[PDB]
Design a protein around this ligand. Structure first.
Ligand SMILES: Nc1ncnc2c1ncn2[C@@H]1O[C@H](CSCC[C@H](N)C(=O)O)[C@@H](O)[C@H]1O
Length: 207
């Protein structure tokens, strides 16, 4: 469970997230896990498109089986209403090179990156996390928002001995959680502004 990839059930987060951010918008949920939040938002708040992405296919299978527990669209040609507005995909959001990140064209209005930063940081280092952040920016359409819930540096130490890669990265990291807001709003990423809503932040892409 080196990617934090075990089945996590909590959702209290819907009290902090605002429905207006999601209604009629295209949403990408990074590290969706078993997709309880993906399904709750997709159902309760009507996004036009909701995609849940996770590296672990066992979580994606479970997420797809969970659709039945949440159960109206007119038929298959109507993808505007739950359950026809949600899909799950297995994949690593972290691209290998910077030239690959630059090939990403916009597709979403909202990107949810909740409790993911630590797992990405430990497994793929500063380089990998910078690439995830830059990809989120490039994937968002002008006017888009990134919902970020990062883990504090204090959380990194515990289980730094999971992998040899995780250990080498824990001692090589220079971009610390406390510096994430400044990095995301820098020319390296591009976000125009940020705000505070673990703590939850909103990063804005210029219209
Ligand atoms: N590079 C990556 N790409 C996609 N998913 C990733 C990833 N690294 C880790 N993950 C997934 O992200 C999750 C971290 S746990 C956070 C779960 C959820 N977003 C929440 O807030 O409850 C795990 O399910 C893990 O498998």
């Amino acid at each position: 469970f080196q990617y934090g990839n075990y089945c996590k059930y909590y959702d209290g987060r819907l009290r902090v997230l605002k429905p207006e951010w999601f209604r009629g918008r295209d949403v990408l949920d990074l590290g969706c896990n078993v997709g309880h939040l993906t399904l709750s938002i997709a159902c309760k708040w009507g996004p036009s498109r909701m995609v849940g992405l996770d590296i672990d296919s066992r979580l994606i299978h479970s997420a797809r089986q969970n659709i039945r527990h949440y159960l109206v669209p007119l038929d298959g040609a109507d993808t505007s209403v739950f359950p026809n507005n949600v899909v799950f995909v297995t994949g690593n959001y972290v691209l290998d090179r910077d030239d690959l990140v630059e090939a990403q064209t916009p597709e979403y209005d909202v990107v949810l990156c909740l409790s993911l930063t630590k797992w990405v940081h430990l497994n793929w280092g500063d380089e990998g996390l910078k690439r995830m952040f830059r990809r989120i920016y490039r994937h968002l359409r002008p006017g888009g928002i990134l919902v970020l819930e990062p883990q504090p540096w204090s959380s990194y130490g515990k289980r730094k001995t999971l992998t040899e890669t995780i250990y080498k990265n824990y001692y090589r990291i220079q971009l610390k959680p406390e510096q994430f807001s400044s990095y995301l709003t820098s020319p390296d990423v591009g976000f125009s502004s940020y705000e505070l809503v673990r703590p939850v932040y909103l990063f804005h892409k210029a219209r």
